[PDB]
Design a protein around this nucleic acid. Sequence first.
DNA 1: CAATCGTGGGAGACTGGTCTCCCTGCAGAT
DNA 2: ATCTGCAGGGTCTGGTTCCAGACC
DNA 3: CACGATTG
Lengths: 163, 163
Amino acid sequence: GWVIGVDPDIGGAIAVLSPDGSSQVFDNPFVHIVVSEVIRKRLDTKSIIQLLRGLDAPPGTTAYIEKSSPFPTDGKQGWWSTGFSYGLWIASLVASGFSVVPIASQTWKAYFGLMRSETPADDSRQAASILFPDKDQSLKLKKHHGRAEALLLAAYGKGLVLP
Amino acid sequence: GWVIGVDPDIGGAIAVLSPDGSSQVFDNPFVHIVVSEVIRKRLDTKSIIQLLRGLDAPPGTTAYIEKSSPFPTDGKQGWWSTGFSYGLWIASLVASGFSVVPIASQTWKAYFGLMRSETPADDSRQAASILFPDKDQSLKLKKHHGRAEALLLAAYGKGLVLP
DNA sequence: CAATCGTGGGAGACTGGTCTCCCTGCAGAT
DNA sequence: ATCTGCAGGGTCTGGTTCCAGACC
DNA sequence: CACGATTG
Ligand SMILES: [Mn+2]
Ligand SMILES: [Mn+2]
Ligand SMILES: [Mn+2]
Ligand SMILES: [Mn+2]
Ligand SMILES: [Mn+2]
Ligand SMILES: [Mn+2]
């Protein structure tokens, strides 16, 4: 029936799949805030929970979320942000009725044959264009790869297959 | 007269002050999980949300939460954790109807004159024992300093004063 | 606005300065 | 079960008993 | 991935 997918980073997205094969994809809401006298983007907690409140996806729907796995060479702020986005999303999903399943990036990439691309984000939008043709206008820009990975997470949880 | 205080780390706690001067304090729920073939503690998302929903504090009650401020010398896992813990609590508090006010640790310590101690954990427990003498039996171990800081955070928000 | 690049970084409270503040993760001692 | 000491750290998944190769 | 930056 219903499946949710969540790419939790700042330019990520949430995707909702209906039993009737239709789909929705939403950019992660954010706000600009002051930290250490500079501007920083940060996920908008209250918009997120409101967004999840207005989904038609019923309670107990599974949400597939990408596991945070920051690289050891990433700085400590990157580690903080991936940690923070993960917790903010997971708690929002659990608080809104949804059962949360963390999926590693290698898993859903392996399942759609996306391993070791020269241009991994481009391929993601292509694969997601093919699984969700009606979302093809929403995947034209390079910054739309977050919408694609949300869709691909949901498509993975749903068990969809590429042609 | 209702105030919540949250110390968000893994040994932290949530303190709830009612308008009749009574007070509760609960340790942060956590679970043991496997990460890279060792065991770790992580906050327990379902249990925190169930606990927030059990509170009689009405909607819009302000929750004072200690701002995450990890040191540049702390490891990247330190930053991840405090990031994760902070977003999980913030999201959990907002979804449960409470207003979230981040408070720097320098603010509530200066408010109580705790700044610049050689035994800052002991002092917090001593100060919370005085503000909340019925919590004295619950503050006699050193590991209880998380209860102390949550109690003191809530005491900051409510405007209490040491005698 | 949309994209590309290179490196991995504190933050906060009372006209920049000064100063003080949190942890995690793992081992070892009782 | 409680405390202390000290340095600041990847994690995951197919494939086993430890690796190889991959990923944000 | 994040964070500052600079590119049309
Ligand atoms: Mn991602
Ligand atoms: Mn991106
Ligand atoms: Mn992404
Ligand atoms: Mn604290
Ligand atoms: Mn402690
Ligand atoms: Mn604490």
